[model samples]
Target: VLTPTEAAVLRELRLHRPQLPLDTLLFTDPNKDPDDVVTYTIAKQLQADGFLRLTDVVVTLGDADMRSQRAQLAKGVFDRLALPDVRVARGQDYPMTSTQAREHSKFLAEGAALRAAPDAVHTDGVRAMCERLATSPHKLGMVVIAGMTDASALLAEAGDLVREKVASITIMGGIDPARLVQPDTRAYNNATDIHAARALYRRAQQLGIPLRILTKEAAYKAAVPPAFYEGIARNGHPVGEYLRDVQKNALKGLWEGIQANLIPGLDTAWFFRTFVALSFDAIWPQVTKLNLYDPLTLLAALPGTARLLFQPTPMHREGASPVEHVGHAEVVRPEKARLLLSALAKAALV
Candidate 1:
């Protein structure tokens, strides 16, 4: 329930970024290579789109080996993007205990030298970040692009700082149970920090903060086609160049990794075509069933069936509704859902 002024602000914010602003925060741990790349691209793109102002970008790393690698990656992107406003916070260079380092090293290999530090240090670091965010007059949004290694500690250290000022959180982790290819399979991100993710999710729910998860399913589905990249390279202006560079350095490898793991022998063009066909075919029959696909020569003569489903209440609750819930309802009464889907498709195609 926003006031008129707040609603207007929200509209302006949405015009710039698809997500709600007040609830947005971008968090990325720089220890991992892939995470760093994703964080940099997303942060730069959000800034470029005028959707967000990057007050502080924190990068946490353990030892010299990890720090040097992460720093180079961060410096390169920051220099290329001219992100002067962003602040880079380096984590403690050494671990707190040799035992913790030994245990961490058993898994990540890099952890032996780059050991885990006291949770208090990372917690303090995040508190500082929250303080910076609270200084702003506008509502805050957060995006966490890091592992859950120290997130819980940070929350505990900050006490009420997080719950008081932070708005929404968009996390690039979690397994969609519906996506299981087998009975027991789970997405790696979710597996990495299930306890931490669950803790955060519960905390967010308790605080009445909106938490939107961009799961592996969504990431897999959002694959850009090779033709799309080619078109952007040829036609996109200055932004086109940035997209092309990202594609060359990061996206190409990412796409390759996905193909190798998920759907072998399938390439980008085929993937997009298949997605479009499956999505459109599913929607087309419902539109036909509702008899709403036909053109309305007279504006007033337009079928009322379409109007019934789109009554404000349904639209507002769409976010909370499960995918299956929407699918079943849409199939039964397709007009409103068709319209909504069409608008989303049009935006994506553009």
Candidate 2:
């Protein structure tokens, strides 16, 4: 049962079957590591499965050290992936100041007008994007992978436009109040623009927009096992090469001050924990439990556990935060473990 808008998007997806146009927008502080490995891997898997061809991508580096090794990490991933239609859009020379934020909002609004078509004179940027998409004989499903950087400006400039035209909004941010230690615990994707995240969430609720949030918790649970990477390396796959590079750079970047804060010592601990948890022999459970002492381990566990634990409800204006409710518990019944095991079976993992 699909709504007219949903049906329209589905038709577009069908038309572009085996190829998807993914628009990823990034906004993080300079020298900060852009956590895009998961997204890249997911996109690659989708592309490989012929579910979608990543037709377009946008990466915005906000005023960071262009030559900084950390910055190169992101670029390296893009290159290694050989993304067909990717564009790297340089941002301001520095983080957004309050004054700049105001100006950006205004600028986005003006640009929206210029981009509007003859019949869409009143539409905002988001709306215009949607309207243009609707006009396509094949509806295009737009996925925005963005952080706070310019979200506030973009929304303020075209919030109404988005409400009118966009089919859905999927955000990869926000914390699960129940799990205080999830990656979303700190300033995350939306943290860069907390004001904007709040505004967008409120607006979406008001308009009854279809919003799907893939929280930090979900990301943490979807871990890539060491064996998987090792297997890729053994197979001589290009993605394996990229993974190896990321691992190597991640280690060196930490020692080089290139990724001081981003690369916490506990990341290794959490990796080991995840590795042990998924390994054939459970001999490392003790070690895994010990690593839990690390703050990073605690942080990772919050999301990892939440992913396997919580259950999400339908879109509602009044309820707990979205991240807090993302599991398949209620319908599946009994316990989350059963539901997870069932899902694994459906995926043929069992």
Candidate 3:
């Protein structure tokens, strides 16, 4: 549980991330990534620990329509967890451009080929966001961990409302140009829909909205220490237990695939990146910290923690890509940032 002083500093808002954890075990899909559940679980526990008030969650499509599937999965998890009175809605299924739409639709079809039907809530994500913003008593904060399609749409449709009602926008994307593997290797979330990202960046700047970025170059600094996972494994709290189950299932599937050699093609790549890294971590979990990206972004968005834990370093656009808009502050801190997040995780687990 959070200390009284800690709980007193939490700020409430509607989260606007792109995906939620989908149940790989329930859906019988070995490839499903269950990390989002880890994030959502943290958010829920934070709410319980009085770290923040999460009013609504709007999930948008990033990689593909798998976002839709993830949305349904998260909605079901929330239904079972049963509290906080949070509303979950699916946002834009397609990216902002016809060009990007083709890429997103391909993934939607891929899911269908795999016999997975996305029963995502049909409500327009932007519209749902507008309704929430219009009705909220306090100005809201936003945490965006996905493509900027929905955010740009909201800005275009109701920039005035956003300027008035939204307190800030914290994003979990962007990278230094020097780190690029290729000149065209755009930032992940930005690449999914660069047009939308460019639009949002320009509009947010114009509307006088405070934008905070957790760049890809710096996000790993807040990795969760493996000892934190060990604590969750031993803790009997319901949320911890649930997260343990998810971890077990995901790891079981990955290990089984490795044993059976079902995952091929990336043999050399996996030998070093997967096998070597995972082996070392298994033997020394205490030394390895999980790069829990979005979770840290969530932590950075909280007013209470941000004021003390993060330093708003100015970010400059050094790329030719339209998505590379400058003038926002990149959220950063020293190594103690990881310590603070790790401590918060332990507190939430208890």
Candidate 4:
């Protein structure tokens, strides 16, 4: 809970960037792409500032087989973020059916020990999450940064409680209606699990839950040159170093993957430009800027923030647009991140 002073600061932030409910549940697919990692890092920043709590991290799987790996990754991040007691829950992979759904992460039995913090995996995540929201004394809040599978399921299992308990919902997918229907569009988060996105959007409308959306255009528009973060990685700062930990061979991994199979956008992704040169070190600074789509979402969800300089027109969900979520369409430029990051910087020292 925020203090009276903190709440006032947050309200000031909302005047520009829009705000999320204070106790937010972050639902995410940890690493669908390199950009997704930035989402986790920003989530850490939110927690550091006391806006989020440790138990709020819930890991959703984009693929049926990937959840186990992501559960461990989430656990590692928990240790990296230093909240060992936080339980990382596994979300559903079977998008539509409850038959495949289980009480705990499906992968935890065999993989829990591998993460830096073995105790981080919560065995009865789904049920526990359901019960918590259902029985919570106050209204809850939720943010979706991955496919809506886990969230969609939650709506189904505990819709009444969530409807009654949740103060608001912020989804980090969807786009303008015209941009969303291209049958072959490259949008990963929405297309990755359209079925789930469609279901969640429909249900949220039915329940009349207070929802705000962070569109794809706004999500990635805030591209910061890798150099900025590269400087961070080289520094001994906790967040920067932690990012460096995962990025150890990321450039190389993407490089190699591109060479062998021609990963879809490799030739165009920022790193692709750097590969011909010998060192990955030179590649980073010159490569792409980090996009804080997730970070921006965190900012949007923050009480004391709205867009720094201007208010975006709200983009409502239009007909048949499975992924269209309505909210102030915020285009988060790279410069915007410096403000939020600077405020959260001191926490890394501890």
Candidate 5:
């Protein structure tokens, strides 16, 4: 669940336009994964690049309703980065539905407060998002990489403001296996809170706002190999170094689990039912291909780089779904995407 693709997107934007104020408001649902901490570290590296300031980046921790050590770990990241100005807050801890499963990951349980201790204070995340949107001079665009709980909450709390201020909403979710090149078609973002997802879509449709979804199809088409990651860390910068270590450790863990023939509740995971039947050789190859879903969504949401990577298609309802209005993004131009990915890696060097 923890992927650095989102961090890569942030890194690309900051490096590309160093002059612009990337008043980025990050809202995270940090329970099952260590990705939030990873993102914060990358942000810290970006700050050291002399382009980003931790003060401009506001992080909100949602889904810590289980009283997880998310806040503590966030504080650790902040302290390690030596950037206390990067404010942290808390948001909704649970989903909109009662059936939403909340399993604490073993990865997180074993890795709490890796860098520092618990000292970060939390405020209202929904309020923070609303206030930021209301006060900002520019129309804020939202990139939803996780579940739509926070986004839906914000929309519910301030529909008119969201309708008026939200320039575009790009979500990294959808399950269209027919269009995908990979085996896994299940999407976690939409599944996390179906009610919230439906609500956000309905409201967006009503508001006549520009809303798009980058599906697994789009992500797999632009999936990077192990070589790409090697290129990323070859530059020797702090960001690359941190990214390299994280990827290495994560890959090692995954490989170990695969070899042991037991991956903590793998049988119950619908995403990997086929993997149980497949050979190790087949599974390892698939695992190596990194799906950059969040990065693709962010790039497509941006005006400058969208055309180079994604081609939008009007979505038609497969079933009797209420929210029929949706834009499905496909990676129609893989060559251009590769170039873009290469550029992102190159930017990491300096």
Candidate 6:
């Protein structure tokens, strides 16, 4: 999620900033999740959290109708968040293709036919990003989730050019059978952009780059309870209100899709199913409840943070930190995870 990641960063920034702080040079572009509603939800949560400021990103691969839906979803959230300086840059619509590059060209070509959001500055994300990195003075660290198309495309086009500029990389995608999330395959992240993932991982290794990987399984060791989020929503807090609206709208969108005989994407649908399974009769718990490794993963990526919390043994296929090789990724007690949850919950209370 463009915004949730942003808001989480902002909240963390407010909460505890690292020595290696993400600065102005650290440009953010969106290569988003297919279930984008969650992305916007977290971003807006920052709106009322303690700070209000400028920020934004672009959409990644999908069909034309889907991409446009994504753009509006993005714009609407940012606009709703109404940051002091919100700017949206439209990104690439094409994939490099694993025998298939998902460019989302149909979404791009159908612009005249699709209903785009109003008055947002759209551009070629890769090229602008290439320039953004090249001109920036500091070497940058990139935090990535599934589908490596964005950076891979930039690397492909630029030709080992930007490596000099990029410092370290943190990926939230990798396979480690030793670590399992509900005993699922680690293939989801890699499968989405197989070639790209391999390429980036190899490039990082060869370049002697510091690349830290957070496997899906290791992330599972950390989870937040439903009520932590409910407290925020129940307060009718502004950011809380924003999240409530997003939750309602996300579910409504799915229900609408179901009504129209349109099957929604798996993320939200599966998430909805998880909530229903987790709590059959509970009403206050909405989408923000449970299954939230994304934000947790983000916090762990910051410098000096590894020692404080997070799993030690099973970081990923790339493997865990030197000190992390001994124990489980999370602390022995769930109290630390609960503490982390309390901190985030406290923010929503404001």
Predicted structure with the largest TM-score when compared to the true one: 4
Q: TM-score per candidate, in order?
A: 0.50, 0.51, 0.66, 0.72, 0.67, 0.61
Q: Rate the local accuracy (lDDT) of all candidates.
A: 0.39, 0.36, 0.53, 0.55, 0.54, 0.45
Candidate 5: list runs displaced more than 4 Å. Answer: 1-25, 29-87, 95-118, 175-186, 235-239, 263-288, 316-329, 345-349
Give the local distance difference test score of model 3.
0.53
Q: Give one digit per residue, the lDDT tens place, for model 6 in 1-350.
A: 12344345334445644434342111221223212333334334433442222233444455434544545545554544444344445445434454433333322221222223644545555575566666666565554544565656666675455567765565555543443111113445555556666676655555555555655555445545555445456756444444444444444555455545577455545645654422222433453434444444444454433444654454333542211221224444344544444454444344
Give the per-residue lDDT of model 5 (tens digit) for 139-222: 666757666667778888978787777777777676344421111125677666666677776677667666677676676666
Report the lDDT of model 5 for residue 133.
70
| Error at 295, model 2, angstroms | 23
Candidate 1: residue 51 lDDT (0-100): 45
- Flag the better candidate by lDDT, 3 or 6: 3
Backbone clash count, each prediction separately: 12, 7, 0, 16, 0, 16
Better of 1 and 2 by TM-score: 2
**Which rank order by TM-score, best down to worst?**
4, 5, 3, 6, 2, 1
Off by over 4 Å in 4: 1-21, 32-37, 62-65, 95-114, 117-119, 176-186, 234-239, 245-248, 255-279, 307-312, 317-329, 332-334, 342-346
Per-residue CA lDDT of candidate 1, range 191-293, in tens?
3345555566556655555554444333222233333333434534333344344444443343455456565767656544444323323432222111111
User: How many clashes show up in model 3?
Assistant: 0
What's the CA error at residue 220 for candidate 5, in Å?
Answer: 0.8
**Model 3 over residues 115-216: C-alpha lDDT tens digits?**
212443444566766776777666777767766677778888888788888776777666435521111126766676677777776677667676666665
For model 1 the local lDDT of residue 6 reads 31
Total colliding residue pairs, candidate 1: 12
**C-alpha lDDT of residue 21 in model 1:** 26
Worst 10 residues of 4 by lDDT: 103-112
**lDDT score for candidate 1 against the true structure:** 0.39
